[PDB]
Design a protein around this ligand. Structure first.
Ligand SMILES: Cc1cc2nc3c(=O)[nH]c(=O)nc-3n(C[C@H](O)[C@H](O)[C@H](O)COP(=O)(O)O)c2cc1C
Length: 312
């Protein structure tokens, strides 16, 4: 049995999508990238009302929210360009998450910008590996040189990281451009640690059975799914895809139970609906100025009132 992983995604990877991905059969769920500069301003707050652990910023904004359900399966992804600041964040969240990931693939010089400075990647990763009891991973995009990609990947493993997620595309290579299954394979063979294949959503993964095909084509230990999970989170379901109306109902119920900010809920729903945003329901969703108005657009107004009342 191989591992089905929810890839990190800014705005999409909040608590409601993570819980929904686990319900549909994901083994590991990554959260959206969170910048170290915001996280170092946060306090850990135990929320007895929602039964969540909250990481609250000085402006009273909840930056990260987790719960007992994802406790052993959530991977905290951070945006960092400083080893001490990275460890400060890991020490804040380590008791509430299952792993620590560092973005090395993004477009303040943190993501794919790090790929050019292997000395900085080496400093950041070793500091985290030595400083936390949690498995450290990272997520990279490939380099323009196959020699430099392979050189960097062996350098990354040497820091003592648990696994490496490989997005089989170079920085500047648009999603239009196909994924490099060959470059992921060359990496998976040369490494002793597990390699997580990533990058084949529209072109390779349209159904559950295609995930195994992509793991074979790349010779990786597991596959990480982003866009296909964003479009329909039931991509993890072995039995087949579920109707979107059904998935969206389950999405909103989680967003209300866990007091997700309505603009975030709205965003994730627009990503699922995409062409259906011109339907009367899509028009109503676009117009929604609150969580109550989102539930109204989806016949969940009764559910919202009963949850809001039971929460207050
Ligand atoms: C909306 C969106 C947000 C993303 N945010 C992040 C992020 O927070 N961290 C990250 O490492 N990659 C981010 N990615 C990239 C994905 O994790 C992934 O590497 C990429 O989409 C290729 O995988 P896929 O073909 O399965 O979509 C994002 C992708 C999308 C579509």
């Amino acid at each position: 049995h191989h591992h089905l992983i929810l890839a990190p995604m800014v705005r999409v990877g909040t608590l409601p999508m993570r819980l929904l991905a686990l319900d549909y059969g994901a083994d590991i769920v990554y959260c959206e990238e969170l910048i170290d500069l915001k996280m170092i301003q946060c306090k850990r707050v135990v929320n007895e009302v929602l039964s969540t652990v909250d990481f609250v910023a000085p402006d009273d904004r909840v930056v990260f929210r987790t719960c007992e359900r994802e406790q052993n399966r959530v991977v905290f992804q951070m945006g960092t360009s400083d080893a001490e600041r990275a460890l400060a964040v890991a020490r804040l969240v380590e008791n509430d998450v299952a792993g620590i990931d560092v973005n090395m693939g993004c477009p303040g010089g943190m993501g794919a910008a790090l790929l050019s400075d292997p000395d900085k990647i080496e400093k950041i990763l070793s500091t985290l590996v030595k400083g936390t009891r949690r498995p450290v991973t990272c997520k990279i995009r490939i380099l323009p040189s196959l020699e430099d990609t392979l050189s960097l990947v062996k350098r990354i493993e040497r820091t003592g990281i648990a696994a490496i997620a490989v997005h089989g595309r170079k920085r500047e290579e648009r999603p239009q451009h196909p994924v490099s299954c060959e470059v992921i394979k060359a990496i998976a063979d040369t490494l002793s640690i597990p390699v997580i294949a990533n990058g084949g959503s529209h072109d390779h993964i349209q159904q559950y059975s295609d995930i195994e095909d992509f793991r074979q084509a790349t010779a990786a230990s597991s596959v990480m799914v982003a866009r296909a999970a964003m479009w329909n989170p039931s991509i993890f379901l072995k039995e087949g895809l579920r109707p979107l109306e059904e998935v969206m109902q389950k999405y909103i119920r989680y967003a209300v139970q866990y007091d997700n900010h309505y603009t975030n809920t709205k965003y994730c729903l627009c990503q699922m609906l995409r062409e259906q945003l011109e339907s009367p329901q899509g028009r109503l969703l676009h117009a929604a100025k609150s969580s109550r108005e989102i539930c109204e657009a989806f016949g969940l107004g009764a559910f919202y009132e009963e949850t809001t009342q039971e929460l207050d």
